[PDB]
Design a protein around this ligand. Structure first.
Ligand SMILES: OC[C@H]1O[C@@H](O[C@@H]2[C@H](O[C@H]3[C@@H](O)[C@H](O)[C@@H](CO)O[C@@H]3O)O[C@H](CO)[C@@H](O)[C@@H]2O)[C@@H](O)[C@@H](O)[C@@H]1O
Ligand SMILES: OC[C@H]1O[C@@H](O[C@@H]2[C@H](O[C@H]3[C@@H](O)[C@H](O)[C@@H](CO)O[C@@H]3O)O[C@H](CO)[C@@H](O)[C@@H]2O)[C@@H](O)[C@@H](O)[C@@H]1O
Lengths: 354, 355
């Protein structure tokens, strides 16, 4: 397909960002939400900070304590026979390898801005930093849906209570209004549709299920983008294919003449993440018209294959300029990259492959 | 608590209920939702039916096929080295004992009615039977919240896509309006508060969490009892206590002068189920004022301790008559029982144990 990976990729790396917690290192600046505001591209960067131990036998988990409003650190020995450290993102109980006890880093959101879409400058301070008991392990993966003058900023809120999805609204990225957890745990990859559709708002979501059910995309409707209901299954995993392990929403749904174009991430059970596409009915987006059989973006550049958690491209938003999509994506849970694609070429791939 | 357990207990057993599927046994009539309608007590019974296998080395999963609207049984060998059959409620994968692949039975809802609250007669036909792709393993544990003339009947909808919670509304238990899955999987034990509270509806719910988090009661608000949000954690598990393994909503919240009285279930990791109480703020039910340290109802009688899944009391509804609560409860995932208690005595126990 025409994939124009920007010459400047990776656009923003951990080298570009100073840690805000003393004696932490920045291990990632990634999975950035995408907005246009006041003539600039805003990336709402996920910045992950890991606390450094000088003893290599020990690792630390950073926990934001909501009751005293400070960082506490939990220590573990790597030889602790009750825990598994083989996944660099998490500290897991050997008896519960399907989950985690702690993360290895703590994330917050920080805005970078660009005039040209290629060269970015960080805002001075964080944008959103854990501020309640649903956020003690961090705030991650902010998505931005702009409806009129209102930006809907929604993000994973991770804590000992579960992984929930929460919403902040703003008109200027300065005065923020907190709207609570719009999806109960366990959920993430929530993408609000950019219009009211035959009298209702909609959002993509992604329940994670303990007992039965795969890691599949769902959809829900809403009268007001505060409360959500009429939950339906939308897109399921496909055994043996690029999305055999999980699927989740990526970019905000894109209105086309052919339907709502859904650029979603898929991963195998080995955790190689790629982007795919789906097409939903314009008037009832609970109906799937088409889906790709092969990816539209794979981790093939070196910054995509190698880093903190290699073989990942993870797109959390894009700017439409006519037929061109300026798509920004996390690479290897480490950095941010940019590429241009064409909506017509993705719609073409959908037609051919379905 | 001075519990008066009804003389007729168990009120309704599997022996009282004939199977609607050819060649199945009724294994439970239990976890009944509770309403008053037209001068009678309604129990919205969960009836569970297990297919009988002619071959004792095979167990059958009874699955409803949504496209063909009939059962399509699935067969599994007891010696199949992939599967674990130790929990009689489910067929589980050995690599996923925290979950299940199938249930051993399929449930639906059937109404039983009573003039006196003690002797029940069954309606002729099922009330709610799996009718869509979200209900292929059954409809379970229907709760009923009456607001004005409208009955909110909400239940677990179990399928391959997960355990969701779905809502049907009605004014007469005859004309039904499906309102969708009101809570996304994985969720159950949803209880809708019986009035609007400072301009919002509320419901208790209970997310099950794959990665992190315990089996804790949450609450959510709603403008219309179709969409919910503002999700908040409400009651957590307590190590070493009767609710150390999980909690969930039981009866509909009861308006009292001291708050919303929540009669909830708690279980230990050994799966002994009791009823507890909590008390929430009357004006903002997201605030917990008190909670019991010991149960209000535990399995003690023989019909509570012994059956298909023993040592369970599981109340899904209650009728208030002044200070008297007429509580109906599943016992041993087998039958329905009745007891009377005093609200004042529950309040008092909350006061004493909170300190
Ligand atoms: O690292 C790859 C992307 O994974 C997700 O986030 C991370 C982590 O993921 C859990 C599940 O959400 C996934 O299906 C699977 C990932 O391969 O396993 C993990 O257990 O969740 C934590 C908590 O939210 C997070 O810190 C990790 O980054 C994506 O949501 C994305 O954030 C990552 O790029
Ligand atoms: O049998 C006891 C009660 O258990 C729950 O329902 C059964 C089963 O519950 C599952 C999880 O929901 C629980 O935390 C735990 C039970 O001890 O483990 C189980 O995996 O769920 C299935 C599917 O919904 C259901 O058929 C079983 O009845 C309870 O909601 C309740 O219905 C039972 O009385």
């Amino acid at each position: 397909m025409n994939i124009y990976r920007y010459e400047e990729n990776p656009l923003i790396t951990p080298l570009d960002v100073k840690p805000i917690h003393e004696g932490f290192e920045v291990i990632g600046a990634f999975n950035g939400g995408v907005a246009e505001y006041n003539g600039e591209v805003l990336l709402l960067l996920r910045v992950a900070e890991k606390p450094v131990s000088e003893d290599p036998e020990i690792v630390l988990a950073p926990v934001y304590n909501a009751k005293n409003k400070e960082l506490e650190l939990q220590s573990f020995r790597l030889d602790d026979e009750n825990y598994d450290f083989e996944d660099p993102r998490m500290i897991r109980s050997k008896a519960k390898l399907e989950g985690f006890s702690y993360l290895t880093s703590l994330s917050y959101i920080r805005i970078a801005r660009s005039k040209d879409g290629h060269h970015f400058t960080l805002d001075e301070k964080p944008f959103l930093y854990p501020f309640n008991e649903y956020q003690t392990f961090g705030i991650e993966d902010a998505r931005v849906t702009q409806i009129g003058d209102t930006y809907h900023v929604n993000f994973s809120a991770v804590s000992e209570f579960g992984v929930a999805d929460a919403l902040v609204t703003t008109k200027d990225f300065e005065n923020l209004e907190y709207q609570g957890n719009i999806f109960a745990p366990e959920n993430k990859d929530v993408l609000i549709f950019p219009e009211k559709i035959n009298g209702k708002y909609y959002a993509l979501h992604r329940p994670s299920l303990k007992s039965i059910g795969n890691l599949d995309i769902w959809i829900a409707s809403s009268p007001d983008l505060r409360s959500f209901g009429d939950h339906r299954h939308l897109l399921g995993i496909r055994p043996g294919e690029y999305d055999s392990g999980r699927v989740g929403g990526g970019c905000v749904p894109i209105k086309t003449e052919e339907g709502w174009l859904i650029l979603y991430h898929g991963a195998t059970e080995e955790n190689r993440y790629v982007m795919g596409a789906a097409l939903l009915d314009l008037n009832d987006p609970t109906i799937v018209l088409k889906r790709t059989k092969t990816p539209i973006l794979e981790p093939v550049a070196d910054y995509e294959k190698n880093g903190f958690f290699g073989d990942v491209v993870f797109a959390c938003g894009a700017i439409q300029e006519g037929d061109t999509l300026h798509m920004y994506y996390g690479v290897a849970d480490t950095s941010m990259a940019g590429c241009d694609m064409k909506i017509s070429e993705i719609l073409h791939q959908l037609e051919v492959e379905a």
